[PDB]
Symmetry: D2
Subunit: 293 residues, 4 copies
């Protein structure tokens, strides 16, 4: 199984993508053992990016690696089609789309047609990005089978029964969990990995949990998983999407600029309180020789 | 109380805003007694529109009437601020915004900051567009009071207790329901009206329910309201954002073009079945001298 | 429209129904204009009562009034049939049942069959007691119509659209809301009334909200309704089902013994704090001549 | 890890516990490799049982094994205290309780006092039976730690993150999942096993999945897990609690009498269709020598 980072998008003070800081971030992640980078996901504020900015993001990361899954979805299908087609020039793993978000009670037929339209035009394998909380609708294993053209799925529902059902109804499909808290479990139960937001800032930990579980050292894996869980929990106190910037600087030593408002940066008191919550975890991780001091 | 139409955005076959159809539609609504038009709401596919298209809609409708509430929200706060400021040269009722959509578990502190930022740059009164199912989070009567700068709220939660709570904690706020099914009830219980998607295709019915209820002919109001309820239910079978187009053409005579994929247009069979579902109600409505032939 | 009290069940110190306290409570409620009494409801801790105790409750209230709805349901259909048959010799308004509770995902077919069984043996009109949060399933206007034998429904779903749909699909059915917060609205919109727990301790308020709304004094109605809303909120702080005992003592003068554990009585600290939060509301209510000093 | 059966309660045609058919069933399960028997759970219609019947069940099963967890909760704490004490003269693994069901919005204070009381009087280890869908409330890892007297937890929430949290916050605690679909996964990820309703009728399947997983043949475990999943899904078509009787007869030979209405027994055509749905699976389990011809 794999650890895939849904890579953060760093913005400048001028609310433009900071390509320099992004390439630095990407190259650290690859050097620390991340298998692939998922570009323009939730964690990368994808829905906050214009079609042109989704492409800009791909180009900056592609300078670093071609191990990219390129998220192109949106509420203007023509733009999503144009991004799928433009990805022909890039030798990447695949493209991806969440379900059309916002609109409630969309018909299954219209959801199916949306995804099939993207497969029709795609020059690469197509991955399902299933984020039911964010989009308001689930594309479960049966609808995924009906759509019939997904090479893989990232399932962000917190219920591994749901995630396992993709593999049961679609045995050739690659199946990942979007949970940071299930890295140990996914690796130990036969699924293909995790698209883990927390690997932005502790890629060392996410990869080590996975290695330990693969080696059937389930107890060590779980004790490290539980330390990772505490960081995730601390990241949610002030909003995880904003907190992920602060944590990546704290743990990895470089900065990722700003988020895009209304994903607002943490203020200096929140930054201090957050670091307070993870100070001790860092020291334990250095002690354990997972982080350089 | 008032009926406010969250007006549909007609698109051309090539997925541009059809300004001529929009103006025809807006004038008909105004002529048929609709009080105000809510522009770039859910029903107008607001989240599907670029800032530039949101401005185009404002300009086209403003050519027809100044009785506009202008919805400007999105996931790029700079764009929302730019639209807010641009509205200064339009003599309209107000601006509005939904909460930042898509992203789950946003901090209340950031939600409050987002809305307060819009209030601070707004040259018109600001309305809260509370659509918790579409955006994933509620801005309830207490958070609204804490934001403190709303002139009104349109509440699309199906719970009239929630809606009355705005009036209770914010006595001077204008409070509307988003439910077509609660026109009779809203007008009877002291609320300020409904922002009703169904008034796109049956403005005569929505206005008439309101008037019957105001006249305290409650039995008459509910009878009409219940016929209007069945049209709403029919519109949901194939997807209501798409069906609203077919139903406007069917009941009002003129067509509104296409929606914007992935809100796909109803096919010929869906349209047949939808008309069959509402044929009877139409003849009933003409019998009652609510619709002409 | 009517006000119906889901009457509290007083228990002694050794955990028996205090028949004498129950009769005093029922007498007061009737004296102050409560139309009917709903016996063995949620608020009376019906689920915590043996069939023998459900019968004792009925016999005690029956000494006071024939304006009784006798709730008989449970998870042993033989007991519910037996209670239904025993009611034959009581001059009462009707019996009622909630859906079988606890068990998730019961088939609709089994749900319908439970209620039709009770209708078949019942010597009185049968009322649907729709408490979906408490039971785990909803019996909506469509299933009610499918069952076909309900004389009325009490709808404790907080969504008045849902409630109105019972009238729309079942025009001859009596339709009550279970919310203390919709007395004004129910009375204004043509529904049949409220089954209001808070009428246990402020019958005078609930009766007065209704008359005001009936007299089309909606603004006075809402100002009183909003006062009542705050008492309801206060009662939730430590648990409404327990708090309901303290507030009856406080507003109406007599105590109602204890609840049945694990519905524990409020300790003395909680009781102090609860009273603190309604003191002001009491003051105003005396000031408005609704309560006696 | 272990497999624990929440044992079905067989009823006679006149709705009394059929003690002899229970003993046959408990005997078969122990013979086929089940580790422990969970008595008076959901699957055994625990909540439909009076205190006397709950004890009847203990006694009958206790003639077969002492490997028993005795569920004793209900909505009268005195009855639950009495069953707990009565357990002193049986040499069993422990007693258990779900949270007080039906009543919504009970304070955490009162929930903690409910369980701590049971611990204060219990002569055996106390297990948490966490069934949030049935009771309407969750007793999560935090609340379970605050209570502080649980030897173990059975977690029926379908979210293994929530299940793992019990062990993270309570490392000495035995932690089971209530899901049949997570037998392979639970064993692979370091949890203590499954309380599986489906082991009533395919104990061979559930024990084998468990063994395959602890042998790190995850591929094989999952192939069998996925076959069992189809059976679980089949069982839900007509109501799983009633279908569990029909499937125990079909797969294991002996019948278990009747459920207790309103858990109604399947009718002849429902039994027909249910068998048609699990016919193929029975074959492949024979072909695999998991089931004898």
């Amino acid at each position: 199984p794999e650890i895939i980072t849904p890579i953060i998008t760093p913005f400048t003070k001028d609310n433009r993508i900071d390509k320099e800081k992004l390439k630095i971030h990407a190259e650290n992640l690859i050097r620390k053992g991340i298998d692939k980078l998922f570009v323009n996901g939730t964690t990368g504020l994808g829905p906050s990016l214009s079609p042109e900015e989704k492409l800009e993001n791909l180009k900056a990361v592609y300078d670093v690696t071609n191990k990219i899954i390129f998220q192109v979805g949106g509420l203007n299908l023509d733009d999503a089609i144009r991004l799928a087609k433009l990805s022909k020039d890039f030798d990447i793993v695949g493209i991806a789309s969440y379900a059309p978000y916002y609109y409630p009670r969309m018909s299954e037929k219209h959801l199916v047609k949306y995804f099939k339209t993207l497969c029709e035009v795609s020059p690469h394998p197509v991955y399902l990005y299933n984020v039911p909380t964010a989009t308001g609708k689930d594309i479960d294993a049966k609808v995924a089978k009906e759509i019939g053209c997904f090479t893989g799925v990232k399932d962000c529902i917190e219920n591994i029964i749901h995630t396992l059902d993709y593999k049961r109804l679609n045995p050739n499909m690659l199946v990942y969990s979007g949970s940071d808290m299930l890295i140990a479990t996914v690796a130990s139960t036969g699924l293909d990995g995790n698209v883990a937001a927390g690997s932005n800032y502790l890629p060392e930990v996410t990869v080590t949990i996975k290695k330990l579980a693969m080696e059937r050292k389930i107890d060590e894996a779980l004790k490290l998983q539980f330390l990772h869980d505490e960081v995730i929990e601390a990241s949610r106190i002030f909003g995880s999407l904003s907190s992920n910037y602060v944590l990546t600087k704290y743990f990895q030593g470089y900065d990722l600029g700003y988020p895009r408002p209304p994903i607002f940066p943490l203020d200096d008191e929140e930054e201090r309180q957050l670091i307070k919550k993870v100070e001790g975890i860092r020291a334990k991780l250095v002690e354990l020789k997972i982080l350089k001091e």
